[PDB]
Design a protein around this ligand. Structure first.
Ligand code: MG
Lengths: 297, 8
């Protein structure tokens, strides 16, 4: 049982040790393409690169590289694309990926500016009347509407392939109060957000994988995906207590390095899954409780 | 060079 595992770790003061063990056991795969000199301006951080085996390839002959990885969770039957916050010169690549991968939703867990420093480009329009055109990939992006809540914002965007003239509605789920290398204000606020993404239909297998990002696409991003996949497994398995969150995280790390960046983020992931499980195990009244507890504007 | 992680 996760509650028992959580207490065992918490009471012994072993979070740093458990987390460091996961880091030590994590997969080590090559990232040769990410390191090619010509790709230097496509990486936000020198210490965060996608593995070659799981990287997302752009469908262009020029240069198919983007710092993004496909996290394919076989048993959970869900895939996610984790990517860095787009750079000024990779915003067109980012939307090209969204288009090509048939994604319906984009989950952003960081702010454009954090601690007086730029952590992600302003890759979507802030005003309806000021749409964006990405010349390099021939895509147009328009803000259709946005619903701003106390700690997160949901936006409806229209993405158009200017080559084929076809358009698609993309849902943007922006968590605006999650500090870098920090944790959500509470399991409640996090789960309320996660279930909003779920209820939107964006994570449905009928769509391409949801695109999840933070500044590097590994810390807050890994937390989001780890919680979601664990809950998926608990709903799917005969014995939900058989889900080992540490093993799920190691499985995810076979696809992208460094998922979950701090011991406290790992600790928070346990709390988020333990709380979310109360809903999966029936008692769907907790969902309204998180809603109320989140104080979403 | 820009780094995401802490090495201090
Ligand atoms: Mg090579």
């Amino acid at each position: 049982e996760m509650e028992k595992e959580f207490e065992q770790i918490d009471k012994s003061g072993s979070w740093a040790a458990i987390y460091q063990d996961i880091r030590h056991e994590a997969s080590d795969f090559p990232c040769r393409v990410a390191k090619l000199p010509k790709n230097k301006n496509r990486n936000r951080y020198r210490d965060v690169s996608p593995f070659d085996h799981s990287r997302i390839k752009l469908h262009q002959e020029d240069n198919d590289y983007i710092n993004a990885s496909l996290i394919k969770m076989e048993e959970a039957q869900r895939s996610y694309i984790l990517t860095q916050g787009p750079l000024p010169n990779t915003c067109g690549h980012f939307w090209e990926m969204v288009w090509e991968q048939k994604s319906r939703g984009v989950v952003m867990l960081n702010r454009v500016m954090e601690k007086g420093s730029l952590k992600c480009a302003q890759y979507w329009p802030q005003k309806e009347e000021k749409e964006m055109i990405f010349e390099d990939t021939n895509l147009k992006l328009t803000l259709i509407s946005e619903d701003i809540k106390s700690y997160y914002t949901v936006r409806q965007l229209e993405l158009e392939n200017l080559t084929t003239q076809e358009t698609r509605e993309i849902l943007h789920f922006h968590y605006t109060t999650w500090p870098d290398f920090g944790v959500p204000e509470s399991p409640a606020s996090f789960l309320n957000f996660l279930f909003k993404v779920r209820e939107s239909g964006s994570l449905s297998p009928e769509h391409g994988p949801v695109v999840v990002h933070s500044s590097a696409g590994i810390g807050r991003s890994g937390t989001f995906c780890l919680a979601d996949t664990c809950l998926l497994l608990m709903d799917k398995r005969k014995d939900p207590s058989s889900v080992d969150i540490k093993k799920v995280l190691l499985e995810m790390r076979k696809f992208r390095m460094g998922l979950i960046q701090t011991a406290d983020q790992l600790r928070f992931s346990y709390l988020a899954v333990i709380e979310g499980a109360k809903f999966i195990m029936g008692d769907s009244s907790v969902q309204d409780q998180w809603k109320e507890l989140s104080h979403e504007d | 060079l820009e780094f995401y992680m802490d090495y201090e």
